Amino acid sequence: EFTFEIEEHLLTLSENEKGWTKEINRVSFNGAPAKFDIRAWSPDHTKMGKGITLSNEEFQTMVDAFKG
Amino acid sequence: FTFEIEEHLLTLSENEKGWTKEINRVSFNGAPAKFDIRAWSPDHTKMGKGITLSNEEFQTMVDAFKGN
Ligand SMILES: Cc1cn([C@H]2C[C@H](O)[C@@H](COP(=O)(O)O)O2)c(=O)[nH]c1=O
């Protein structure tokens, strides 16, 4: 299907007046395992924007640091 | 094209070929530093695409993870 499916949405960091969003989601390319993704999303969610993907350790490393 | 890593906050990742995924305060092209997350060469002269965040966007992120 060659597409990016938001498996799960976690958080919404911002939103511009045009209705795009900065989100943190678990996102799945082409049926591959869902990775952690912080990215700009269009209102309907069809078009996505720029942003990084994270492996588990990266995210986990990250959140543990925002924690102690 | 110019940038500036003004503060390094956290390193999330090694890499087989020495890249590092980092959370930083980066300024691009003379613009005020924003919080920024991407991959960096071992010599931080090359990078991949990545997300940048306002501070409100960044704290919104940190908060949420402190609280789950
Ligand atoms: C000098 C230079 C910088 N950049 C910036 C913008 C991106 O955030 C990052 C690399 O992105 P890229 O993978 O799309 O080229 O570095 C380029 O994309 N191309 C260039 O030629």
Short mmCIF file of all heavy atoms in Angstrom, two decimals, chain A residues 10-15 22-24 38-40 50-55 57-59 61-63 65-68, chain B residues 10-14 21 23 34 37-39 49-54 56-58 60-62 64-68:
data_model
loop_
_atom_site.label_atom_id
_atom_site.label_comp_id
_atom_site.label_asym_id
_atom_site.label_seq_id
_atom_site.Cartn_x
_atom_site.Cartn_y
_atom_site.Cartn_z
N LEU A 10 -0.14 10.26 19.97
CA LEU A 10 0.23 10.33 21.38
C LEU A 10 0.01 11.72 21.97
O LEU A 10 -0.49 11.85 23.09
CB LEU A 10 1.68 9.88 21.59
CG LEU A 10 2.06 8.47 21.15
CD1 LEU A 10 3.23 7.97 21.97
CD2 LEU A 10 0.92 7.53 21.30
N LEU A 11 0.35 12.75 21.20
CA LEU A 11 0.35 14.11 21.73
C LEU A 11 0.25 15.14 20.61
O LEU A 11 0.67 14.88 19.50
CB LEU A 11 1.63 14.31 22.52
CG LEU A 11 1.81 15.62 23.26
CD1 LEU A 11 0.79 15.71 24.40
CD2 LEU A 11 3.23 15.70 23.75
N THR A 12 -0.30 16.31 20.88
CA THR A 12 -0.32 17.36 19.87
C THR A 12 0.38 18.58 20.42
O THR A 12 -0.13 19.25 21.33
CB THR A 12 -1.75 17.78 19.48
OG1 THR A 12 -2.58 16.63 19.29
CG2 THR A 12 -1.73 18.63 18.20
N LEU A 13 1.55 18.88 19.87
CA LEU A 13 2.38 19.95 20.40
C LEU A 13 1.85 21.33 20.05
O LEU A 13 1.77 22.20 20.91
CB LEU A 13 3.82 19.79 19.89
CG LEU A 13 4.53 18.48 20.23
CD1 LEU A 13 5.93 18.51 19.70
CD2 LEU A 13 4.54 18.23 21.72
N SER A 14 1.47 21.53 18.80
CA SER A 14 0.92 22.82 18.40
C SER A 14 -0.13 22.68 17.33
O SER A 14 -0.48 21.57 16.94
CB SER A 14 2.02 23.72 17.87
OG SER A 14 2.22 23.49 16.48
N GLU A 15 -0.64 23.82 16.86
CA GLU A 15 -1.48 23.89 15.66
C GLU A 15 -1.45 25.29 15.05
O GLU A 15 -1.59 26.26 15.77
CB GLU A 15 -2.93 23.53 15.96
CG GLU A 15 -3.77 23.53 14.70
CD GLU A 15 -5.25 23.28 14.95
OE1 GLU A 15 -5.58 22.50 15.88
OE2 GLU A 15 -6.07 23.87 14.20
N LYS A 22 1.62 19.90 14.95
CA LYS A 22 2.84 19.21 15.33
C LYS A 22 2.42 18.08 16.29
O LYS A 22 1.86 18.34 17.36
CB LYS A 22 3.81 20.20 15.99
CG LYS A 22 5.28 19.83 15.82
CD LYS A 22 5.89 20.55 14.63
CE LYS A 22 6.51 21.88 15.03
NZ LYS A 22 7.07 22.66 13.88
N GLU A 23 2.66 16.83 15.91
CA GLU A 23 2.18 15.70 16.70
C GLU A 23 3.30 14.72 17.02
O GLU A 23 4.34 14.73 16.38
CB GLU A 23 1.08 14.92 15.97
CG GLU A 23 -0.13 15.76 15.57
CD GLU A 23 -1.21 14.93 14.91
OE1 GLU A 23 -1.07 13.69 14.89
OE2 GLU A 23 -2.20 15.52 14.42
N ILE A 24 3.06 13.88 18.01
CA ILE A 24 3.92 12.76 18.24
C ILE A 24 3.04 11.55 18.10
O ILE A 24 2.10 11.38 18.87
CB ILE A 24 4.50 12.78 19.64
CG1 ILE A 24 5.50 13.92 19.78
CG2 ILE A 24 5.18 11.44 19.94
CD1 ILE A 24 6.40 13.81 20.99
N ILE A 38 7.71 12.46 15.26
CA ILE A 38 7.29 13.80 15.61
C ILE A 38 7.35 14.58 14.32
O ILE A 38 8.42 14.75 13.75
CB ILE A 38 8.22 14.44 16.61
CG1 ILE A 38 8.52 13.45 17.75
CG2 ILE A 38 7.64 15.75 17.09
CD1 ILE A 38 9.66 13.86 18.61
N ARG A 39 6.19 15.06 13.87
CA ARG A 39 6.06 15.55 12.51
C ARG A 39 4.87 16.49 12.38
O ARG A 39 3.96 16.45 13.21
CB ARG A 39 5.87 14.34 11.61
CG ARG A 39 5.91 14.62 10.15
CD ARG A 39 5.91 13.31 9.40
NE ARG A 39 7.00 12.45 9.80
CZ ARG A 39 8.23 12.52 9.30
NH1 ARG A 39 8.53 13.43 8.39
NH2 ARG A 39 9.16 11.68 9.72
N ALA A 40 4.90 17.34 11.36
CA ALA A 40 3.78 18.21 11.02
C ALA A 40 2.76 17.45 10.17
O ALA A 40 3.13 16.77 9.21
CB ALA A 40 4.26 19.43 10.28
N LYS A 50 7.54 17.81 7.65
CA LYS A 50 8.90 17.41 8.02
C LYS A 50 8.90 17.00 9.48
O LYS A 50 7.99 17.37 10.21
CB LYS A 50 9.90 18.56 7.79
CG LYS A 50 9.96 19.03 6.33
CD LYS A 50 10.86 20.27 6.14
CE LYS A 50 11.12 20.60 4.64
NZ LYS A 50 10.17 21.60 4.04
N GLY A 51 9.92 16.24 9.88
CA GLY A 51 10.07 15.77 11.25
C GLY A 51 10.82 14.46 11.34
O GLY A 51 10.81 13.69 10.40
N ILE A 52 11.46 14.19 12.47
CA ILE A 52 12.25 12.96 12.64
C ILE A 52 11.45 11.73 13.06
O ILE A 52 10.32 11.82 13.55
CB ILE A 52 13.39 13.12 13.67
CG1 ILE A 52 13.00 14.11 14.78
CG2 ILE A 52 14.68 13.54 13.00
CD1 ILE A 52 11.71 13.78 15.53
N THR A 53 12.07 10.57 12.88
CA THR A 53 11.53 9.31 13.33
C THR A 53 12.46 8.82 14.42
O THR A 53 13.62 9.18 14.44
CB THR A 53 11.55 8.31 12.19
OG1 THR A 53 10.99 8.92 11.02
CG2 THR A 53 10.74 7.10 12.53
N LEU A 54 11.97 8.02 15.34
CA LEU A 54 12.85 7.55 16.39
C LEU A 54 12.75 6.06 16.54
O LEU A 54 11.65 5.51 16.53
CB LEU A 54 12.53 8.23 17.73
CG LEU A 54 12.53 9.76 17.82
CD1 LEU A 54 11.88 10.15 19.11
CD2 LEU A 54 13.92 10.30 17.77
N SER A 55 13.89 5.41 16.70
CA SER A 55 13.92 4.04 17.17
C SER A 55 13.50 4.05 18.64
O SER A 55 13.38 5.11 19.24
CB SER A 55 15.30 3.44 17.02
OG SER A 55 16.19 4.08 17.91
N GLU A 57 14.94 2.88 21.54
CA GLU A 57 15.91 3.35 22.49
C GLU A 57 15.97 4.88 22.49
O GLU A 57 16.03 5.50 23.55
CB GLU A 57 17.28 2.75 22.20
CG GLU A 57 18.34 3.12 23.22
CD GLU A 57 19.43 3.96 22.61
OE1 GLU A 57 19.52 3.96 21.36
OE2 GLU A 57 20.19 4.64 23.36
N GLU A 58 15.90 5.49 21.31
CA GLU A 58 16.01 6.94 21.18
C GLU A 58 14.88 7.63 21.93
O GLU A 58 15.09 8.55 22.72
CB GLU A 58 16.01 7.35 19.71
CG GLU A 58 17.20 6.80 18.95
CD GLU A 58 17.21 7.21 17.50
OE1 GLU A 58 16.19 7.00 16.81
OE2 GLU A 58 18.24 7.75 17.05
N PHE A 59 13.67 7.17 21.67
CA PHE A 59 12.51 7.70 22.34
C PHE A 59 12.63 7.45 23.82
O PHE A 59 12.50 8.35 24.63
CB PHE A 59 11.27 7.02 21.82
CG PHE A 59 10.02 7.58 22.37
CD1 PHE A 59 9.48 8.74 21.83
CD2 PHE A 59 9.40 6.98 23.44
CE1 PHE A 59 8.33 9.28 22.34
CE2 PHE A 59 8.25 7.51 23.96
CZ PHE A 59 7.71 8.67 23.40
N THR A 61 15.26 6.68 25.63
CA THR A 61 16.35 7.49 26.16
C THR A 61 15.81 8.88 26.43
O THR A 61 16.04 9.44 27.50
CB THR A 61 17.50 7.62 25.15
OG1 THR A 61 18.19 6.37 25.03
CG2 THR A 61 18.49 8.71 25.57
N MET A 62 15.08 9.40 25.46
CA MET A 62 14.58 10.76 25.51
C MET A 62 13.67 10.96 26.69
O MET A 62 13.92 11.84 27.51
CB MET A 62 13.81 11.10 24.24
CG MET A 62 13.16 12.46 24.24
SD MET A 62 12.47 12.93 22.47
CE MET A 62 10.87 11.81 22.43
N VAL A 63 12.62 10.15 26.78
CA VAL A 63 11.62 10.29 27.83
C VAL A 63 12.18 10.07 29.24
O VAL A 63 11.76 10.72 30.18
CB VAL A 63 10.36 9.42 27.56
CG1 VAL A 63 10.74 7.99 27.27
CG2 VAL A 63 9.40 9.47 28.73
N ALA A 65 15.05 10.97 30.16
CA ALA A 65 15.78 12.21 30.44
C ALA A 65 14.83 13.33 30.85
O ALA A 65 15.16 14.14 31.71
CB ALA A 65 16.59 12.63 29.25
N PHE A 66 13.64 13.35 30.25
CA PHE A 66 12.58 14.26 30.67
C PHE A 66 11.94 13.75 31.95
O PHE A 66 10.75 13.93 32.16
CB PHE A 66 11.45 14.30 29.63
CG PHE A 66 11.86 14.76 28.27
CD1 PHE A 66 11.03 14.52 27.18
CD2 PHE A 66 13.05 15.44 28.06
CE1 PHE A 66 11.37 14.94 25.92
CE2 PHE A 66 13.41 15.86 26.80
CZ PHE A 66 12.56 15.62 25.72
N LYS A 67 12.69 13.07 32.80
CA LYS A 67 12.08 12.38 33.90
C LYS A 67 13.05 12.23 35.06
O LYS A 67 12.62 12.12 36.21
CB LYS A 67 11.61 11.00 33.45
CG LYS A 67 10.18 10.92 32.97
CD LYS A 67 9.85 9.47 32.61
CE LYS A 67 8.37 9.15 32.78
NZ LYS A 67 7.92 9.27 34.21
N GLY A 68 14.34 12.22 34.77
CA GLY A 68 15.34 12.01 35.80
C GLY A 68 16.26 10.83 35.49
O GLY A 68 15.84 9.67 35.39
N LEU B 10 20.95 16.62 24.79
CA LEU B 10 20.84 15.18 24.98
C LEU B 10 21.22 14.49 23.68
O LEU B 10 20.92 14.99 22.61
CB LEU B 10 19.41 14.83 25.36
CG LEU B 10 19.06 13.40 25.72
CD1 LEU B 10 19.74 13.01 27.04
CD2 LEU B 10 17.54 13.24 25.80
N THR B 11 21.91 13.37 23.80
CA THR B 11 22.28 12.53 22.67
C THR B 11 21.49 11.24 22.83
O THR B 11 21.48 10.64 23.91
CB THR B 11 23.80 12.25 22.67
OG1 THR B 11 24.50 13.36 22.12
CG2 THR B 11 24.11 11.04 21.84
N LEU B 12 20.82 10.82 21.77
CA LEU B 12 19.85 9.75 21.88
C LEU B 12 20.36 8.45 21.31
O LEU B 12 19.75 7.40 21.50
CB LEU B 12 18.61 10.13 21.09
CG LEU B 12 17.91 11.44 21.40
CD1 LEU B 12 17.14 11.90 20.19
CD2 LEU B 12 16.97 11.26 22.58
N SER B 13 21.48 8.53 20.60
CA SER B 13 21.82 7.46 19.67
C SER B 13 23.26 7.51 19.18
O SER B 13 23.77 8.58 18.85
CB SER B 13 20.88 7.56 18.47
OG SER B 13 20.81 6.36 17.71
N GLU B 14 23.91 6.35 19.14
CA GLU B 14 25.12 6.18 18.34
C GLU B 14 24.66 5.88 16.91
O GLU B 14 23.59 6.32 16.49
CB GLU B 14 25.97 5.03 18.88
CG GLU B 14 27.05 5.43 19.89
CD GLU B 14 27.18 4.43 21.04
OE1 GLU B 14 26.44 4.59 22.04
OE2 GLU B 14 28.01 3.49 20.95
N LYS B 21 21.95 11.00 17.09
CA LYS B 21 20.69 11.72 17.07
C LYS B 21 20.65 12.56 18.32
O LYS B 21 20.83 12.07 19.42
CB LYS B 21 19.51 10.76 16.99
CG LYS B 21 18.19 11.46 16.68
CD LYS B 21 17.11 10.49 16.25
CE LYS B 21 17.26 10.10 14.79
NZ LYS B 21 16.38 8.95 14.45
N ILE B 23 19.28 16.19 20.60
CA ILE B 23 18.35 17.26 20.86
C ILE B 23 19.19 18.45 21.24
O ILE B 23 19.99 18.38 22.17
CB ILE B 23 17.45 16.94 22.03
CG1 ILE B 23 16.72 15.63 21.79
CG2 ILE B 23 16.46 18.05 22.28
CD1 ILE B 23 15.57 15.41 22.77
N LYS B 34 16.20 27.41 17.67
CA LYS B 34 15.02 26.68 18.13
C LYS B 34 15.49 25.32 18.65
O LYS B 34 16.62 24.90 18.38
CB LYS B 34 13.99 26.50 16.99
CG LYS B 34 13.55 27.81 16.31
CD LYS B 34 12.45 27.58 15.26
CE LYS B 34 11.10 27.29 15.93
NZ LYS B 34 10.07 26.67 15.01
N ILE B 37 15.88 18.39 16.67
CA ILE B 37 16.17 16.98 16.83
C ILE B 37 16.41 16.36 15.46
O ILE B 37 15.49 16.30 14.64
CB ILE B 37 15.00 16.22 17.48
CG1 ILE B 37 14.54 16.93 18.75
CG2 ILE B 37 15.39 14.80 17.77
CD1 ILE B 37 13.34 16.30 19.42
N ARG B 38 17.64 15.90 15.22
CA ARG B 38 17.97 15.27 13.95
C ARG B 38 19.21 14.42 14.10
O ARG B 38 19.75 14.29 15.19
CB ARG B 38 18.19 16.34 12.89
CG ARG B 38 19.27 17.31 13.22
CD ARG B 38 19.26 18.45 12.23
NE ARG B 38 18.09 19.32 12.35
CZ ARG B 38 17.40 19.78 11.31
NH1 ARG B 38 17.76 19.42 10.09
NH2 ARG B 38 16.37 20.59 11.47
N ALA B 39 19.67 13.83 13.00
CA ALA B 39 20.93 13.08 13.02
C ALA B 39 22.09 13.96 12.59
O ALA B 39 21.94 14.86 11.75
CB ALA B 39 20.84 11.84 12.17
N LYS B 49 17.37 15.47 7.79
CA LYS B 49 16.22 16.30 8.11
C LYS B 49 15.81 16.01 9.55
O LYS B 49 16.20 14.97 10.11
CB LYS B 49 15.04 16.04 7.17
CG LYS B 49 15.21 16.63 5.78
CD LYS B 49 14.16 16.10 4.82
CE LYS B 49 13.97 17.05 3.64
NZ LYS B 49 13.43 18.37 4.10
N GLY B 50 15.04 16.93 10.13
CA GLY B 50 14.63 16.82 11.52
C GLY B 50 13.59 17.85 11.90
O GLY B 50 13.29 18.76 11.14
N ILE B 51 13.05 17.71 13.09
CA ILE B 51 11.99 18.57 13.56
C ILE B 51 12.61 19.74 14.33
O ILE B 51 13.68 19.60 14.93
CB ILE B 51 11.03 17.77 14.48
CG1 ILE B 51 9.72 18.51 14.70
CG2 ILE B 51 11.69 17.41 15.78
CD1 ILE B 51 8.67 18.20 13.69
N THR B 52 11.97 20.90 14.27
CA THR B 52 12.33 22.02 15.13
C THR B 52 11.09 22.47 15.89
O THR B 52 9.97 22.32 15.42
CB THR B 52 12.95 23.19 14.36
OG1 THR B 52 12.01 23.69 13.39
CG2 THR B 52 14.21 22.75 13.65
N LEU B 53 11.28 23.02 17.08
CA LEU B 53 10.16 23.29 17.97
C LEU B 53 10.30 24.65 18.63
O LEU B 53 11.40 25.08 18.96
CB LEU B 53 10.08 22.22 19.04
CG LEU B 53 10.04 20.75 18.58
CD1 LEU B 53 9.91 19.80 19.74
CD2 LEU B 53 8.89 20.55 17.61
N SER B 54 9.17 25.33 18.82
CA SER B 54 9.15 26.53 19.63
C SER B 54 9.36 26.07 21.06
O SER B 54 9.36 24.87 21.31
CB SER B 54 7.81 27.26 19.49
OG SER B 54 6.72 26.36 19.48
N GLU B 56 7.33 26.60 23.61
CA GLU B 56 6.04 26.16 24.11
C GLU B 56 5.74 24.78 23.60
O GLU B 56 5.14 23.96 24.30
CB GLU B 56 4.92 27.12 23.71
CG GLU B 56 4.84 27.43 22.23
CD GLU B 56 5.72 28.60 21.83
OE1 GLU B 56 6.69 28.93 22.56
OE2 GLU B 56 5.44 29.21 20.78
N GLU B 57 6.17 24.51 22.37
CA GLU B 57 6.03 23.19 21.78
C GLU B 57 6.92 22.22 22.51
O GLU B 57 6.56 21.06 22.68
CB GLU B 57 6.41 23.22 20.31
CG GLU B 57 5.26 23.45 19.39
CD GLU B 57 5.72 23.65 17.97
OE1 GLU B 57 6.92 23.94 17.79
OE2 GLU B 57 4.91 23.52 17.03
N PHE B 58 8.09 22.68 22.94
CA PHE B 58 9.06 21.80 23.56
C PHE B 58 8.65 21.46 24.98
O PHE B 58 8.70 20.30 25.39
CB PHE B 58 10.46 22.41 23.52
CG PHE B 58 11.54 21.48 24.01
CD1 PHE B 58 12.13 20.57 23.15
CD2 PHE B 58 11.97 21.52 25.33
CE1 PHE B 58 13.13 19.72 23.60
CE2 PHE B 58 12.97 20.67 25.78
CZ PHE B 58 13.55 19.77 24.92
N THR B 60 5.54 21.67 26.24
CA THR B 60 4.37 20.82 26.01
C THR B 60 4.78 19.36 25.85
O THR B 60 4.17 18.47 26.41
CB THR B 60 3.56 21.24 24.76
OG1 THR B 60 2.80 22.41 25.05
CG2 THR B 60 2.60 20.16 24.33
N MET B 61 5.85 19.13 25.10
CA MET B 61 6.38 17.78 24.97
C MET B 61 6.95 17.24 26.27
O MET B 61 6.58 16.15 26.69
CB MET B 61 7.46 17.72 23.89
CG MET B 61 7.94 16.31 23.62
SD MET B 61 9.21 16.17 22.15
CE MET B 61 10.76 17.07 22.97
N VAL B 62 7.84 18.00 26.90
CA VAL B 62 8.46 17.53 28.13
C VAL B 62 7.43 17.22 29.21
O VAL B 62 7.47 16.16 29.81
CB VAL B 62 9.50 18.52 28.69
CG1 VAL B 62 10.04 17.97 29.98
CG2 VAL B 62 10.64 18.72 27.72
N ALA B 64 4.13 16.50 29.15
CA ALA B 64 3.39 15.30 28.82
C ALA B 64 4.13 14.01 29.17
O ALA B 64 3.51 13.03 29.57
CB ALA B 64 3.05 15.32 27.36
N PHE B 65 5.46 14.00 29.03
CA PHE B 65 6.22 12.78 29.27
C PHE B 65 6.61 12.61 30.73
O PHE B 65 6.86 11.49 31.19
CB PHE B 65 7.45 12.72 28.38
CG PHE B 65 7.12 12.50 26.95
CD1 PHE B 65 7.98 12.95 25.95
CD2 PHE B 65 5.95 11.87 26.58
CE1 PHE B 65 7.66 12.75 24.62
CE2 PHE B 65 5.62 11.67 25.25
CZ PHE B 65 6.47 12.12 24.27
N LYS B 66 6.67 13.73 31.44
CA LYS B 66 6.84 13.69 32.88
C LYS B 66 5.60 13.06 33.49
O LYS B 66 5.69 12.34 34.47
CB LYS B 66 7.06 15.09 33.44
CG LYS B 66 8.41 15.71 33.08
CD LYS B 66 8.56 17.13 33.64
CE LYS B 66 9.99 17.66 33.46
NZ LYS B 66 11.00 17.15 34.45
N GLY B 67 4.45 13.32 32.88
CA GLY B 67 3.18 12.87 33.43
C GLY B 67 2.58 11.58 32.87
O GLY B 67 1.72 10.99 33.51
N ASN B 68 3.04 11.15 31.70
CA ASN B 68 2.48 9.99 30.98
C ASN B 68 1.01 10.16 30.61
O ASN B 68 0.68 10.84 29.64
CB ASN B 68 2.69 8.68 31.77
CG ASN B 68 4.13 8.49 32.24
OD1 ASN B 68 4.84 9.46 32.51
ND2 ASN B 68 4.57 7.23 32.33
#
